[PDB]
Design a protein around this ligand. Structure first.
Ligand SMILES: COc1ccnc(Nc2ccc(C#N)c(OCC=C(C)C)c2)n1
Lengths: 410, 556
C-alpha cells in the first residue's frame, strides 16, 4: 500500500517513443480494455503537460482468444534505475510450466513522481481524433521495476507452497512465474492447479490470463554435437564440403586437421567423381570425429556480458540457432521444425522461433539475448506484432549478408 | 446572468535547471508606444493581460507592426526566449488525416473557434514568465508592465493546450451525437454528417449552444466557409478529393532550385495522379549544395517530364473510403528501380495513388523491391484505413513460391493475387542445389598485387581446359569475380564452378538481378543464358587441388 520510490538514471529523461500504426481491431480492443482499466483506477487520462510516450499494442496469448494489452516498455526498462536496494536447478528440472502472474501487479500503487514516465497513447485511424492519452497508477505489466517492487509481496505469497514443497523450483521473470517439477504431469498440473489457488486466495484479500499453463521440458544436448557424414563412397564434392565444414570447426576445436583430406582434393577432378579415401585420410577423419565428441574448451557463462542469439532459416520450416557471448564459444545451440499454423509464412515461423529461444534463455540464465535476425528490418517491423504472444520483448538487429555458415548447422 | 463553466488550467513548468526570460526591451518610436498602450488597454479590459508590479524580474520583448495598406497597428510579443525555456509538451497536431481515409459525407460545415483561444486561461504560476514592458514616452517614467492571463500567440504550449482543452469540451457532444463527426484542426472545427440539411444545420446550432456552456463564441449560420475546402494542399469536397492545382512551369533552362520544386510538385501530385515519375529529375540533385548551378536536362529527364505533363493535363479526383468494401492495392513496375501503385475499392475509382523507389545499394533484385513496396503500402494503409489491402501484383504465384522457399532470409507478403500486366517480375536465374553430373567442372581463381594493382584471373577444368588473363588496375575482389565470369563465358549450358571467394559467394547467394558493378552485371547476363549452374565454395590455401593449381597460376 506504501509505494516504493523510483527514479530514472542520472541525466536521462523519460521515454519519448513514437506510437506505431495499429489496425482497427487492435484499436477497438485497446479502447475497451483501457476504458475498463480506467474505471478500476489502474490508469488515468493525462494532459498535454506530459510529453513522454511508450508504444502500446494488443496480442493474444498462446491458445487464447481474448485481447491482451501489451506495452513495449523496452526504452523505459533501459532508462529505469536498477533495483539492488539464478536458479540453476530450473533448467535441470524435468518439466516447467509458465504462468502469467502479471495481473497481480495491478494491486500495488505506483510512485506518484514516476507515473508520468509510463505515458502511452491509443492512436486513432487516420488521425481523425486525438490519440487517447493515459498513464499508470499501479505497477504496469512489462516494466522491469514491476517484479522488483512486487518481489517482497510475492515471497510472502509463496512461503507456504515452498515450505510445503521443497522440491519444486519456482522462478519469476517479468510477468511470468516459472514452476519446475520432477513429478508426473498429473501431479504436475495438479500442483500447478494448487498454486493457482494461492493467487485467487490472495486475489480477494478477476484475472484474465491467470488460468493458462504453458508446458515445456529441457532437451538432451545443451550444445548439439558437430557431426560428420559416414559414407562408403565419397565424391569430390562430398570431400570439398567435408573440408569446408572441418575448416570451420577448427575455429571452435583447435586440434582439427584437414591436410590429409585436402590432399585428396589435389588435382582437377569432376565434382561428381568418386574418390577412394587413403588410409591417411581415414585416420585424420577418425581423429576429427573423436575431437568433436569432446566438449568445447574454455566455455563459461558471464552475467556481466550480453547473450547473443543467431538464427538461420534452413528451409522446409526448419530453423537452427546458437546462443553465445564470445564468437565460437557457444553456450547453447538448437534446431526447430515445429512451427504451428505457419506453413506458408516465414515471418510467423521466425517470430515463434524468437519467442521459443527467448524462453529457453530466461530458463537457463534468467535474461534475454540480443537476436541477429535473418530478415530485412522493414519486413520484420511490419509483421512481428501480428504473431507475438509473449509479455516480454527482447532486443534484435538484422543480418543483411548471407552467412556462409548455414550449411555447417545443416 | 447564466453561469458559464470554467476551463481547467494545465500546469506548466520550465525545463529543469532553466529559469525564465530576462531579455532587454527594444527602443521604440513615440508613435509605436501610443499604439501599444491602446491595444493593451483593450486587452486588459477584456481580461487577456494584467498590469504587474516591480517585483517580477522577467521580461519578453514586445513589438508593433504596421498592417499593410492600413493606418492601425498590431501587437507582436516575441516569445522566442521563453519558448527555449518552456517544458516540452505532447504535440498532438503532428498527425493529420489523409483525405483518402475520410468517409463520404452529405454535409460538412466548419466552425471558426479561434475566439476560444483567449477564453483559455494560462496556469497562474507560469504567467510571470510571460512578462513584457511597454516603454514610456521619452523613457521618463517606468515602462508599463504586463503579464498574460491566457494562452499567448507564439508561445510554445499554446497550440497543444488549446487543442486538449477543446477536445475535453467536445467529448460529451461528440459521444452523445454519434450521427455526426467532428474534426479539430488549429482554429477550425469540421463537422460532417449524413443527415438532412435540416437536421444537420440543427446539430450545428446545438453544437454552438453546447460551446456557449463554456462561454465560447462562434460565428452565425452564415459561417464564413463552406465546401470546397482548401486544406493542407488539398481541395476537399463532400464526395471527392484532390490536391490543389499542379502547374509545371515552362522553362528554357532549369537550375538546382527549380528542379527540387519540380520534384516536390510531382511528389505531391503522385498521391492522386497515377504513373508520376521523379527518378531522372532527382538524379540531378546529387551531392552538390549550390542551389544556383544551372543543370542541363538529359534526354531522359526531358522525356520523363513530357510523360509527366501528359498525366497532369486534366484533373483527377480521389474518392473516399467505404468501410463496407475491401481495399485493393495494385502495383506496377516502372523500371530503373521505380514502382507505382493505386489503392481502390471499385474499378476505376482510386482512393489514392503513390510510388516507391529502390533503396540505395550495390546489388538488387525485382522481387526484393516488390516486397519493400508491399511493406510500405501495408504500413501506410494501416495508418490511413486501419487495415491491410488485398494486393494485385505482377508476379506469378509460382515465381513467388520459388523465391521465398529458397531465399536465405525470412520473407512474407500478405494476401495477394497475380495481375497479368507486363512487365512481370520474374526470377532470372536459379542455381543448382547439387553438382551436375556430366557437366564440366571449372576451378576458378584470381589474385591481385596490392601495390601495383596487377592481377590475374583464370580457371582449370577437369577436361584440361585452362585460361589465365592478365589484368591491370584491379583488386583481389574484382579478380575473383572476373575468374567466375571467364568460367561462365567459356563453358557450355551446364557447368559446375568451384571458387574460394567468400566475397563472390556473398554476392551471388544474395541473388541480384542488377548491379552497380558492371562486372556483377556481366556475370548475371551469363547466368541468365545458362541451363544449369552449380557454384561450390572451398576454403582457400588448403591443398584443394584444381583450386590449388589455379591459385598457383594466378598468384604468379
Ligand atoms: C470531419 O471529420 C470527418 C471524419 C471522417 N470523415 C470525414 N469526411 C469528410 C468528407 C468530406 C469533407 C469535405 N469537404 C470533409 O472535410 C473535413 C475534413 C478535413 C478538413 C480533414 C470530411 N470527416
Amino acid at each position: 500500500i506504501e509505494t516504493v520510490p523510483v527514479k530514472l538514471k542520472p541525466g536521462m529523461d523519460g521515454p519519448k517513443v513514437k506510437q506505431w500504426p495499429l489496425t482497427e481491431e487492435k484499436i477497438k480492443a485497446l479502447v475497451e480494455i483501457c476504458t475498463e482499466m480506467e474505471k478500476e483506477g489502474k490508469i488515468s487520462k493525462i494532459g498535454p503537460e506530459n510529453p513522454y510516450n511508450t508504444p502500446v499494442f494488443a496480442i493474444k496469448k498462446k491458445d487464447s482468444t481474448k485481447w491482451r494489452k501489451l506495452v513495449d516498455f523496452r526504452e523505459l526498462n533501459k532508462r529505469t534505475q536498477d533495483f539492488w536496494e539464478h536458479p540453476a536447478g530450473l533448467k535441470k528440472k524435468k518439466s516447467v510450466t509458465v504462468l502469467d502472474v502479471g495481473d497481480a501487479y495491478f494491486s500495488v500503487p505506483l510512485d506518484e513522481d514516476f507515473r508520468k514516465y509510463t505515458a502511452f497513447t491509443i492512436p486513432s485511424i487516420n488521425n481523425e481524433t486525438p490519440g487517447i492519452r493515459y498513464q499508470y497508477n499501479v505497477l504496469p505489466q512489462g516494466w522491469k521495476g514491476s517484479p522488483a517492487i512486487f518481489q517482497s509481496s510475492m515471497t510472502k505469497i509463496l512461503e507456504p507452497f515452498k515450505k510445503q514443497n521443497p522440491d519444486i523450483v519456482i522462478y519469476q521473470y517479468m510477468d511470468d512465474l516459472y514452476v519446475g517439477s520432477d513429478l508426473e504431469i498429473g501431479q504436475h498440473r495438479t500442483k500447478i492447479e494448487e498454486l493457482r489457488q494461492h493467487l485467487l486466495r490472495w486475489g480477494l484479500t478477476e484475472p484474465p490470463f491467470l488460468w493458462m499453463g504453458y508446458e515445456l521440458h529441457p532437451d538432451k544436448w545443451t550444445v548439439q554435437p558437430i557431426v560428420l557424414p559416414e559414407k562408403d563412397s565419397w565424391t569430390v564434392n562430398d570431400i570439398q564440403k567435408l573440408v569446408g565444414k572441418l575448416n570451420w570447426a577448427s575455429q571452435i576445436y583447435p586440434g582439427i586437421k584437414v591436410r590429409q583430406l585436402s590432399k585428396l582434393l589435389r588435382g582437377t577432378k569432376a565434382l561428381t567423381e568418386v574418390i577412394p579415401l587413403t588410409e591417411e585420410a581415414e585416420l585424420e577423419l577418425a581423429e576429427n570425429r573423436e575431437i568433436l565428441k569432446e566438449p568445447v574448451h574454455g566455455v563459461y557463462y558471464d552475467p556481466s556480458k550480453d547473450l547473443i542469439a543467431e538464427i538461420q532459416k534452413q528451409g522446409q520450416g526448419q530453423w537452427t540457432y546458437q546462443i553465445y557471448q564470445e564468437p565460437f564459444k557457444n553456450l547453447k545451440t538448437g534446431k526447430y521444425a515445429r512451427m504451428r499454423g505457419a506453413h506458408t509464412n516465414d515471418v510467423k515461423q521466425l517470430t515463434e522461433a524468437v519467442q521459443k529461444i527467448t524462453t529457453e534463455s530466461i530458463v537457463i540464465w534468467g535474461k534475454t539475448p540480443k537476436f541477429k535476425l535473418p530478415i530485412q528490418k522493414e519486413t520484420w517491423e511490419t509483421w512481428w506484432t501480428e504473431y507475438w504472444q509473449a509479455t516480454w520483448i527482447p532486443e534484435w538487429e538484422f543480418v543483411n549478408t548471407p552467412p556462409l555458415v548455414k550449411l555447417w548447422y545443416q | 446572468m447564466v453561469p458559464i463553466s470554467p476551463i481547467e488550467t494545465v500546469p506548466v513548468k520550465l525545463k529543469p535547471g532553466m529559469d525564465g526570460p530576462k531579455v532587454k526591451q527594444w527602443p521604440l518610436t513615440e508613435e509605436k508606444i501610443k499604439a501599444l498602450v491602446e491595444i493593451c488597454t483593450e486587452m486588459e479590459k477584456e481580461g487577456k493581460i494584467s498590469k504587474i508590479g516591480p517585483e517580477n524580474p522577467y521580461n519578453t520583448p514586445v513589438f508593433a507592426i504596421k498592417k499593410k495598406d492600413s493606418t492601425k497597428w498590431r501587437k507582436l510579443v516575441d516569445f522566442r526566449e521563453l519558448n527555449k525555456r518552456t517544458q516540452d509538451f505532447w504535440e498532438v497536431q503532428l498527425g493529420i488525416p489523409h483525405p483518402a481515409g475520410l468517409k463520404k459525407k452529405k454535409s460538412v460545415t466548419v466552425l471558426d473557434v479561434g475566439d476560444a483561444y483567449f477564453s483559455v486561461p494560462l496556469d497562474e504560476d507560469f504567467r510571470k514568465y510571460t512578462a513584457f514592458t511597454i516603454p514610456s514616452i521619452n523613457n521618463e517614467t517606468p515602462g508599463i508592465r504586463y503579464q498574460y492571463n491566457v494562452l499567448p500567440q507564439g508561445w510554445k504550449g499554446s497550440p497543444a493546450i488549446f487543442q486538449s482543452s477543446m477536445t475535453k469540451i467536445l467529448e460529451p457532444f461528440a459521444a452523445q451525437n454519434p450521427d455526426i463527426v467532428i474534426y479539430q484542426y488549429m482554429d477550425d472545427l469540421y463537422v460532417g454528417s449524413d443527415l438532412e440539411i435540416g437536421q444537420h444545420r440543427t446539430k450545428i446550432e446545438e453544437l454552438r449552444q453546447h460551446l456557449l456552456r463554456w462561454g465560447l463564441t462562434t460565428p452565425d449560420k452564415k459561417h464564413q466557409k463552406e465546401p470546397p475546402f482548401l486544406w493542407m494542399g488539398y481541395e476537399l469536397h463532400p464526395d471527392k478529393w484532390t490536391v490543389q492545382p499542379i502547374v509545371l512551369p515552362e522553362k528554357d533552362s532549369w537550375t538546382v532550385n527549380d528542379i527540387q520544386k519540380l520534384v516536390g510538385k510531382l511528389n505531391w501530385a503522385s498521391q492522386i495522379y497515377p504513373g508520376i515519375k521523379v527518378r531522372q529529375l532527382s538524379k540531378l540533385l546529387r551531392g552538390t549544395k549550390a542551389l544556383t548551378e544551372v543543370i542541363p536536362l538529359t534526354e531522359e529527364a526531358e522525356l520523363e517530364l513530357a510523360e509527366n505533363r501528359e498525366i497532369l493535363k486534366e484533373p483527377v479526383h480521389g474518392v473516399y473510403y467505404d468501410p463496407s468494401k475491401d481495399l485493393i492495392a495494385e502495383i506496377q513496375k516502372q523500371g530503373q528501380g521505380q514502382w507505382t501503385y493505386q489503392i481502390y475499392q471499385e474499378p476505376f475509382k482510386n482512393l489514392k495513388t503513390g510510388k516507391y523507389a529502390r533503396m540505395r545499394g550495390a546489388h538488387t533484385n525485382d522481387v526484393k523491391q516488390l516486397t519493400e513496396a508491399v511493406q510500405k503500402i501495408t504500413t501506410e494503409s494501416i495508418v490511413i484505413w486501419g487495415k491491410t489491402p488485398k494486393f494485385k501484383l505482377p508476379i506469378q504465384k509460382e515465381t513467388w513460391e520459388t523465391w521465398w522457399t529458397e531465399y536465405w532470409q525470412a520473407t512474407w507478403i500478405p494476401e495477394w493475387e497475380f495481375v497479368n500486366t507486363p512487365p512481370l517480375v520474374k526470377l532470372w536465374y536459379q542455381l543448382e542445389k547439387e553438382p551436375i553430373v556430366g557437366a564440366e567442372t571449372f576451378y576458378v581463381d584470381g589474385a591481385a598485387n596490392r601495390e601495383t594493382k596487377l592481377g590475374k584471373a583464370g580457371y582449370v577444368t577437369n577436361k584440361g581446359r585452362q585460361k589465365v588473363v592478365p589484368l591491370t588496375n584491379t583488386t583481389n575482389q574484382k579478380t575473383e569475380l572476373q575468374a567466375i565470369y571467364l568460367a561462365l563465358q567459356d563453358s557450355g549450358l551446364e557447368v559446375n564452378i568451384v571458387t574460394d571467394s567468400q566475397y563472390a559467394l556473398g554476392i551471388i547467394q544474395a541473388q541480384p538481378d542488377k548491379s552497380e558493378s558492371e562486372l556483377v552485371n556481366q556475370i548475371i547476363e551469363q547466368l541468365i543464358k545458362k541451363e544449369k549452374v552449380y557454384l561450390a565454395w572451398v576454403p582457400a590455401h588448403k591443398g584443394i587441388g584444381g583450386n590449388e593449381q589455379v591459385d598457383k597460376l594466378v598468384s604468379a
